[PDB]
Design a protein around this ligand. Structure first.
Ligand SMILES: CCCCCCCCCCCCCCCCCC(=O)OC[C@H](COP(=O)([O-])OCC(O)COP(=O)([O-])OC[C@@H](COC(=O)CCCCCCCCCCCCCCCCC)OC(=O)CCCCCCCCCCCCCCCCC)OC(=O)CCCCCCCCCCCCCCCCC
Ligand SMILES: CCCCCCCCCCCCCCCCCC(=O)OC[C@H](COP(=O)([O-])OCC(O)COP(=O)([O-])OC[C@@H](COC(=O)CCCCCCCCCCCCCCCCC)OC(=O)CCCCCCCCCCCCCCCCC)OC(=O)CCCCCCCCCCCCCCCCC
Ligand SMILES: CCCCCCCCCCCCCCCCCC(=O)OC[C@H](COP(=O)([O-])OCC(O)COP(=O)([O-])OC[C@@H](COC(=O)CCCCCCCCCCCCCCCCC)OC(=O)CCCCCCCCCCCCCCCCC)OC(=O)CCCCCCCCCCCCCCCCC
Ligand code: BCL
Ligand code: BCL
Ligand SMILES: CC[C@H]1c2cc3[nH]c4c(c3C)C(=O)[C@H](C(=O)OC)c4c3nc(cc4[nH]c(cc(n2)[C@@H]1C)c(C(C)=O)c4C)[C@@H](C)[C@@H]3CCC(=O)OC/C=C(\C)CCC[C@@H](C)CCC[C@@H](C)CCCC(C)C
Ligand SMILES: CC(C)C/C=C/[C@H](C)C/C=C/[C@@H](C)CCC[C@H](C)CCCC[C@@H](C)CCC[C@H](C)CCC[C@@H](C)CCCC(C)(C)O
Ligand SMILES: CCCCCCCCCCCCO[C@@H]1O[C@H](CO)[C@@H](O[C@H]2O[C@H](CO)[C@@H](O)[C@H](O)[C@H]2O)[C@H](O)[C@H]1O
Ligand SMILES: CCCCCCCCCCCCO[C@@H]1O[C@H](CO)[C@@H](O[C@H]2O[C@H](CO)[C@@H](O)[C@H](O)[C@H]2O)[C@H](O)[C@H]1O
Ligand SMILES: [Fe+3]
Lengths: 46, 94, 299, 251, 276, 48, 46, 48, 46, 47, 45, 47, 40, 47
């Protein structure tokens, strides 16, 4: 699997992976926060 | 009243920004934790100032944590701006 | 510096223009120079060739304009004061519904019908003039077929849709605010024109023509320092200016045009705005009478 | 279909339009591919088969010129494929670095196309870009300032030379180039008007793209009273190179 | 890959931020730091739209709609399931548009050309910001922004127009419409003229700019020239958009919401020249 | 190579990459255990 | 079947496959979240 | 001459590719089994 | 029949075929999912 | 010779045919299962 | 009739014919699906 | 001209006719099956 | 330090600073979205 | 790579990790204060 770095430059691949992971985390956090059950700030609508 | 009184925040932010503007060791440390720290040290200054002067009632009134936060919000936000412009005199020195 | 204005403007003789084929008449000889025109563009204000079709076009158009204006003056008791007061609210109204497609009395749509006839003849004569002015210089007739699209929308608004509805009363009046009100009441009477799909397409192509002409003007001004405004020569012999323009747009959005195909894009967007408009108008009333109901039936 | 059916004339007309418009987009995107194709595959790509795209470029188009001549596009001879550049990195999409002097190589913002080494003839079979000394009947319209006489100055404040003549376009009355007697070598070089601030800020005309000495290196025209398309690109490219590569130590 | 002539121009340098970290291309597209940021914002926005639709009743593309907050929230942050998604999609969209303009600036610098295209795009950005930020702020609540839906923002346009009587009588709006119709006219004219010169009648040589000047004279009366036409086109489109933005700023913040644009014109009918 | 890394450097980078990826995965796992202890997901067909 | 990599650049193919797989996974997850029976965050009323 | 590679490179890449693809498919199959255990799909024509 | 590959670039033809097949598959899946009878997630009431 | 040789064309075509056939048979199994789940093609009155 | 391929490039002709055939098949399927008698998914109602 | 020799033309045309004919046969079988499922062309009084 | 053989800090630092500032802004706006943590 | 020595990497890494941990300490204190103000993560019923 180390061969993947003969294909992709590690600097740009790493930065792009970080951007992707941060965006995915942002989206999952928003999705949780928009629900009622997983709103860890206000709790359910009740 | 406390709001217009909490200019302790602005002057103390000017002081710390001037300090770290003089004490910025090398060049290109403006782009480093001199202008950045001058931005974020401000809200903490105004937080501790509001904490010390809301217990000791100055506007004829003693405040809770919530009321103190609502009061000290805007000085914190203006400080977030007054930090960097006061620091900018670092590069305006050299 | 950027090329929004010309710093140094040179001035010389007046150009008579390209000689024409042996099928036209001697053109005018006005050829005057306006300073501000040259400030924003070129400075010459002639010579306007005005042949048979141009003169008959202006004659028919001014017959129509005279009819409209005399009717607006009569509708106000010939008072020039009240004419100036009410001008934007005055109009030669279309015929009444009770008359269908007949020739109604003059004060109940006969004058409207005659003005519309003469305006249509004026516009067709002007179209013929554009066609001949292009093909008398040996050029293509792309401008004429772009004009034919606007003419098709105008005919659909004033002639075709009133035909298919069986009444001249469907057509717009000849007035500024009254024809705005006609537009509004046309949308209101036939459902909601936002749910006419060809109306949506016409708006898409109008917005796209504005977008495209902003893009193209900005692109040519950005590479004008490399001779980008000479588009024909940059197409026949590609220079670095059009290469830079193509590369700007290819690096921005992944695809670019050439010096000629960008003008095909432009032509087609501008033409498809009134073409889809005319289709959507011809469909509104003869085919679909409530566009919101149609949209609900689909989405 | 019938009055009660789900299918009706309006949506049938809409789908007819969608088909026509997909066809038209294909045709337009196909016309877009008359220059710059086939594509040049980059590092790590097989170069055996050409890269063209999903609307393949059309057959070469043949334009007829005035003097019975003929030009077929794409203008592949204008490409200048191999230039003085080296990849800044082995991976695809990496930028290139100019190996030599980007002002002389013609790379980056200083690139030009291998245009025909002949002037534009306009309509009367004469060069359209000519010095005012060669276009009798035209005049600078003293309503605006007169560039001639003003000494042209570089970007670093060094005077570069003196404006000697204004080159204009015929049949499109417009100043295109300023002739510049270079400082002290008795040589005349062209300066594109858009690359100059001919306003007399103080006393002179100022060019911020290159600095004062660089006016010696502007590509000179072979004739004296006419300029070819190739020299036009070379001059505008020499001046465009300064937008990225000069920055005349003005810090 | 590259166009057959592109390699000359794919040089390093000209970026604003980041140095050479993002100074590269992905296929045709130049990336830069702002390209990464633009794709980030666009994708977060599209995913928030998809999530808002997943919470909604339908997946129908025409009926998808991200609605602004209720007027009860004023100019404050609304809960995510009660209008906050609209605010965050708006922030992502303005971020995407701004970083797109900046990436265009970087490309302009790398190619050595003027910045007319990002400047012109800034006008569309300004019109959007007027619609979703400036006007609802001046009117006091985010509920005045339009919903992000293909046919619900048309309903918003309809309701907003009809809330001022007939929006046609909005004067800045009439000026903006005149500019748009003239922009379409000039685009047709310019495209057709260049296509006529390049693709002439049978047996004819490719015509010159002189023929274009002649026919433009015979049609419009005078000549603007090859650079004048592109200047005029840029100006017409930009002024159309600017007067649309003015149009929207003056209706609701300036003319009251239940006002009448047809009635505003009575100031002319009521002049003492002819009133009594 | 395409990236310009010798297989020595590729292996060296890959070691640190998998170490970091696995630390990230372990932190994510304890985060999900904590989140489940706060709010379990995956309800029954009738609801929680 | 290894011959496919004599046709296509395996690097570009790998990136395209990643983008396509992620897009499909996101689409399917959002489809499920939009349903009532398979929504796993708030539950069976949606 | 071929579109880019050699049969050695193609076979090496294909070996790694097939291994990764198989483990990806195996993870997907486990995921689907668990999902079905949580909520079966494909109802009868009357419902669930 | 193999002669058709002497006409069409097999890479381009094959990516076209894959794009077309994926588009047709998602279109048929979405059509089925929009019907009441063949919806396999929520069920027959749709 | 729009790119390929005779041998490459024949090899590509053999692989194309066999993989198209595998695609077809997998899709046939898919449709047999789909029909077992819910048949289409109703009668003129319904299901 | 083989002479038609002297008139038209077989590549462009073949691509255009395939596009046309697929579009026509899609249109006929959607027309049938929009009717009540020939809708094979939901049925006559 | 399409830049095709008459040998190429006849070859392409023979293969094209074969393919067109197989397509027609498949379509005919499809229409027979479709008619068995639902006949079109009603009488003037309906189905 | 091993990360500093990549990402020379003369430019991989201001990016980190703007990222941290953006994340702080996002979290503050999310807090202002709620009622329990809206400190205004 | 990056034009940064191993020794220069370590010498920058020193101040980097120091200011990073200072930032982490300030954030942790801010969170303790925020929690003492109003805790988050309620139960499935409410605060
Ligand atoms: C479970 C089932 C079985 C599973 C598998 C089991 C076995 C597993 C193991 C084996 C299999 C796995 C491994 C497979 C590896 C495959 C690798 C591969 O294919 O790499 C390709 C290739 C690899 O790199 P390479 O070797 O350099 O490629 C050389 C090629 O010769 C390319 O040379 P070229 O550059 O000359 O050709 C480029 C061409 C390549 O593409 C084409 O030739 C055709 C592209 C256009 C297709 C148009 C649509 C046609 C079909 C319509 C039907 C519906 C479409 C989709 C609709 C979706 C919604 C319903 O693309 C273009 O020309 C540009 C297209 C621009 C599109 C612009 C609009 C996009 C958005 C539109 C909507 C908004 O990479 C790419 O092709 C990159 C681009 C990919 C996207 C193409 C365009 C997508 C268009 C989307 C639809 C738009 C219209 C709607
Ligand atoms: C909604 C969710 C998001 C959906 C997004 C769209 C999904 C479908 C497309 C997905 C494509 C994924 C590609 C992944 C990478 C593949 C591997 C790779 O990089 O290989 C090199 C590969 C090809 O390199 P090359 O062979 O040197 O390129 C020359 C061509 O082969 C031959 O030269 P050429 O001149 O014939 O063509 C050049 C040009 C072809 O022209 C374009 O790319 C045009 C793109 C825009 C088309 C217009 C769209 C209009 C949509 C209107 C829809 C209205 C609907 C509602 C109406 C009411 O570029 C391409 O070849 C295709 C590039 C990808 C096109 C799609 C880009 C995203 C569009 C999003 C919309 O480069 C790329 O594929 C570009 C990668 C970067 C773009 C993809 C990321 C975009 C992110 C957008 C976010 C915001 C969306 C809104
Ligand atoms: C649908 C789905 C399938 C299709 C999907 C794909 C669609 C797109 C395909 C690619 C299009 C490419 C393209 O635009 O090429 C432009 C390109 C332009 O020329 P070029 O290659 O740049 O250079 C040519 C030289 O410079 C020499 O130039 P030139 O001096 O000959 O002038 C060039 C000029 C013109 O080129 C021409 O070929 C046009 C003139 C031909 C000779 C004179 C005949 C006059 C006939 C008058 C008929 C009146 C109604 C016209 C209706 C047309 C549409 C049905 O070019 C254009 O205008 C561009 C073409 C677009 C014209 C649009 C016209 C809009 C009319 C709006 C309504 C007007 C109402 C009447 C108003 C009258 C005044 C008051 O080539 C063409 O124009 C050739 C194609 C012309 C097509 C004519 C119509 C054929 C279809 C008939 C109807 C078939 C369906 C219904 C059957 C009957 C059912 C009952
Ligand atoms: C009644 C409905 C039944 C059902 C009945 C059937 C029947 C009948 C069939 C299938 C078939 C399929 N079903 Mg099923 N299927 C159902 C539910 C599902 C679900 C789900 C989430 O519920 C999924 C994911 C699938 C998926 C699948 C696929 C495995 C397969 C589609 C063929 C194909 O992929 O062509 C695509 C093939 C390609 C090669 C495309 C490759 C794409 C390449 C990599 C490039 C694309 C570039 C792309 C445009 C880039 C942008 C990507 C975007 C970001 C997304 N089914 C339900 C339960 N299904 C078909 C099959 O088995 O065929 C073999 C089939 O005949
Ligand atoms: C309440 C009003 C309705 C509405 C009712 C209508 C009606 C009715 C129509 C439009 C039409 C259009 N609408 Mg609308 N429209 C609405 C809302 C909008 C909105 C918006 C932001 O909400 C926009 C951008 C538009 C935009 C548009 C255009 C896309 C389209 C006009 C095409 C054109 O270029 O005509 C410009 C070209 C012409 C008008 C014809 C050219 C005239 C001739 C050729 C020139 C003759 C000049 C003459 C010789 C000069 C002398 C004459 C004498 C002085 C008399 N509408 C709402 C929903 N709209 C038209 C259309 O086509 O839609 C299908 C149309 O008929
Ligand atoms: C591609 C579609 C767009 C388009 C295209 C287009 N229009 C065109 C052309 C083209 C390609 C021409 O070649 C032709 C022309 O000569 O342009 C300079 C023309 C033309 N489009 C014109 C107008 C026009 N175009 C409009 C719209 C559009 N034209 C579309 C948006 C509108 C609108 C939006 O209402 C108008 C008013 C004319 C300038 C001209 C056709 C002139 C004509 O037919 O003259 C007939 C003669 C008379 C009626 C005699 C009197 C003439 C004067 C009244 C002329 C005044 C012109 C103008 C100032 C009128 C403005 C409105 C008035 C109420 C004030
Ligand atoms: C036998 C029959 C059946 C054949 C005829 C059949 C024909 C084919 C009918 C076709 C008619 C259709 C096509 C017409 C379509 C109508 C147009 C869409 C109009 C819409 C917009 C009109 C206004 C915006 C412009 C009005 C003019 C202006 C306001 C007034 C000008 C007059 C004065 C100022 C002149 C000052 C002059 C003074 C009086 C001083 O002297
Ligand atoms: C110049 C553009 C092209 C030339 C004109 C294009 C149209 C040419 C053919 C027109 C055919 C006549 O079109 C036909 O008009 C008649 C009367 O006019 C309409 O007939 C009916 O219209 C409506 C129907 O509610 C009623 O007014 C009335 O019952 C009757 O007149 C038909 O519904 C229409 O189909
Ligand atoms: C290090 C990063 C720190 C980021 C710190 C965050 C700073 C705070 C961001 C600004 C948020 C202000 O949030 C919002 O502001 C507006 C503008 O006045 C307030 O004021 C508004 O009140 C009501 C609605 O509430 C409106 O009708 C009124 O017109 C307006 O005055 C809102 O009540 C408040 O909810
Ligand atoms: Fe142009």
């Amino acid at each position: 699997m180390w061969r993947i770095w003969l294909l992709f430059d590690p600097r740009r691949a790493l930065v792009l992976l970080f951007v992707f992971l941060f965006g995915l985390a942002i989206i999952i956090h928003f999705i949780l926060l928009s629900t009622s059950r997983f709103n860890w700030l206000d709790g359910p609508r009740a | 009243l406390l709001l217009v009184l909490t200019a302790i925040a602005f002057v103390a932010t000017a002081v710390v920004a001037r300090v770290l503007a003089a004490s910025a060791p090398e060049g290109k440390l403006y782009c480093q934790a001199a202008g950045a720290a001058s931005m974020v040290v401000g809200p903490f200054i105004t937080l501790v100032a509001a904490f010390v002067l809301g217990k000791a009632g100055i506007g004829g009134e003693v405040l809770d944590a919530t009321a103190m936060l609502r009061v000290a919000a805007l000085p914190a936000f203006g400080t977030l701006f007054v930090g960097p412009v006061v620091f900018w005199f670092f590069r305006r020195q050299r | 510096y950027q090329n929004i204005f010309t710093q140094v403007q040179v001035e010389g003789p007046a150009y008579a223009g390209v000689p024409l084929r042996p099928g036209s008449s001697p053109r005018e000889t006005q050829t005057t120079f306006n300073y501000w025109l040259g400030k924003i563009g070129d400075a010459q204000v002639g010579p306007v060739y005005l042949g048979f079709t141009g003169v008959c076009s202006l004659l028919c158009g001014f017959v129509a304009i005279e009819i409209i204006g005399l009717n607006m003056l009569a509708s106000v008791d010939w008072s020039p004061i009240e004419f100036l007061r009410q001008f934007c609210w005055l109009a030669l109204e279309p015929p009444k519904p009770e008359y269908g497609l007949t020739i109604p009395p003059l004060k109940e749509g006969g004058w409207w019908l005659m003005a519309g006839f003469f305006l249509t003849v004026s516009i067709a004569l002007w179209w013929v003039r554009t066609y001949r002015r292009s093909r008398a210089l040996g050029m293509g007739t792309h401008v004429s077929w772009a004009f034919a699209s606007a003419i098709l929308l105008y005919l659909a608004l004033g002639f075709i849709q009133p035909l298919l509805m069986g009444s001249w009363s469907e057509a717009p009046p000849f007035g500024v605010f009254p024809h705005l009100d006609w537009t509004n009441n046309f949308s209101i009477k036939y459902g909601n024109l936002y749910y006419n799909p060809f109306h949506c397409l016409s708006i898409a192509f109008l917005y796209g023509s504005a977008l495209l002409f902003a893009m193209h003007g900005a692109t040519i001004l950005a590479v004008s320092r490399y001779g980008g405004e000479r588009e024909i020569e940059q197409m026949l012999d590609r220079g670095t200016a059009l290469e830079r323009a193509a590369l700007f747009w290819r690096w921005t959005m992944g695809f670019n045009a050439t010096a000629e195909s960008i003008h095909r894009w432009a032509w087609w967007f501008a033409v498809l705005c009134p073409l889809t408009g005319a289709i959507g108008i011809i469909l509104t009333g003869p085919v679909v009478d409530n566009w919101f109901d149609w949209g609900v039936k689909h989405g | 279909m019938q009055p009660g059916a789900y299918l009706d004339l309006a949506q049938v007309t809409l789908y007819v339009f969608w088909i026509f418009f997909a066809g038209l987009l294909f045709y337009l995107r196909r016309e877009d591919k008359r220059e710059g194709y086939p594509l040049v595959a980059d590092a790590g790509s097989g170069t055996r088969l050409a890269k063209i795209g999903v609307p393949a470029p059309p057959d070469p188009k043949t334009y007829l010129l005035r003097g019975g001549a003929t030009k077929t596009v794409p203008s592949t001879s204008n490409d200048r494929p191999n230039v003085a550049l080296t990849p800044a990195a082995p991976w695809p999409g990496a930028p290139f670095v100019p190996t030599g002097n980007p002002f002389a190589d013609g790379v980056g913002p200083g690139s030009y196309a291998q245009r025909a080494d002949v002037p534009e003839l306009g309509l009367d079979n004469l060069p359209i870009i000519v010095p005012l000394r060669a276009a009798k009947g035209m005049f600078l319209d003293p309503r605006d300032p007169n560039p001639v006489g003003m000494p042209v100055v570089g970007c670093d404040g060094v005077v570069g030379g003196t404006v000697t003549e204004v080159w204009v376009d015929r049949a499109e009355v417009l100043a295109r180039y300023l002739e510049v007697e270079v400082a002290k070598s008795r040589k005349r070089v062209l300066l594109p008007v858009p690359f100059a601030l001919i306003n007399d800020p103080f006393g002179k005309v100022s060019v911020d793209a290159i600095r004062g000495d660089q006016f010696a290196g502007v590509p000179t025209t072979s004739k004296g009273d006419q300029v070819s398309k190739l020299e036009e690109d070379k001059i505008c490219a020499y001046y465009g190179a300064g937008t990225l590569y000069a920055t005349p130590l003005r810090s | 890959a590259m166009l057959s002539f592109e390699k000359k121009y794919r040089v390093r340098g000209g970026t604003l931020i980041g140095g050479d970290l993002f100074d590269f291309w992905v296929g045709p597209f130049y990336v830069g730091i702002f390209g990464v940021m633009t794709v980030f914002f666009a994708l977060i926005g599209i995913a928030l739209i998809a999530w808002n639709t997943a919470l909604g009743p339908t997946w129908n593309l025409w009926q998808i709609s991200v609605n602004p907050p209720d007027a009860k929230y004023g100019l404050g942050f609304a809960p995510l399931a009660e209008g906050g998604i609209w605010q965050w999609v708006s922030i992502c969209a303005t971020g995407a548009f701004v970083t797109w303009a900046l990436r265009e600036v970087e490309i302009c610098r790398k190619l050595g050309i003027g910045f007319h295209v990002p400047f012109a795009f800034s006008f569309a950005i300004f019109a959007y910001v007027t619609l979703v930020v400036i006007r609802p702020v001046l009117m006091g609540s985010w509920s005045y922004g339009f919903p992000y839906g293909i046919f619900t923002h048309l309903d918003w346009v309809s309701n907003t127009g009809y809330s001022y009587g007939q929006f046609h009588y909005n004067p800045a709006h009439m000026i903006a419409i005149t500019f748009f119709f003239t922009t379409c006219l000039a685009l047709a004219l310019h495209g057709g003229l260049v296509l006529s010169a390049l693709n002439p009648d049978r047996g004819e040589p490719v015509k010159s700019p002189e023929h274009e000047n002649t026919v433009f004279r015979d049609l419009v009366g005078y000549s603007i020239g090859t650079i004048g036409i592109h200047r005029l086109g840029l100006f017409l489109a930009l002024s159309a958009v600017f007067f649309s933005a003015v149009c929207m700023i003056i209706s609701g913040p300036v003319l009251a919401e239940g006002g009448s644009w047809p009635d505003w014109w009575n100031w002319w009918r009521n002049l003492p020249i002819w009133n009594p | 190579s395409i990236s310009g890394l010798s297989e020595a450097e590729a292996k060296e980078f890959h070691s640190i990459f998998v170490t970091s990826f696995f630390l990230f995965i372990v932190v994510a796992v304890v985060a999900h255990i904590l989140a489940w202890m706060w709010r379990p997901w995956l309800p029954k067909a009738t609801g929680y």
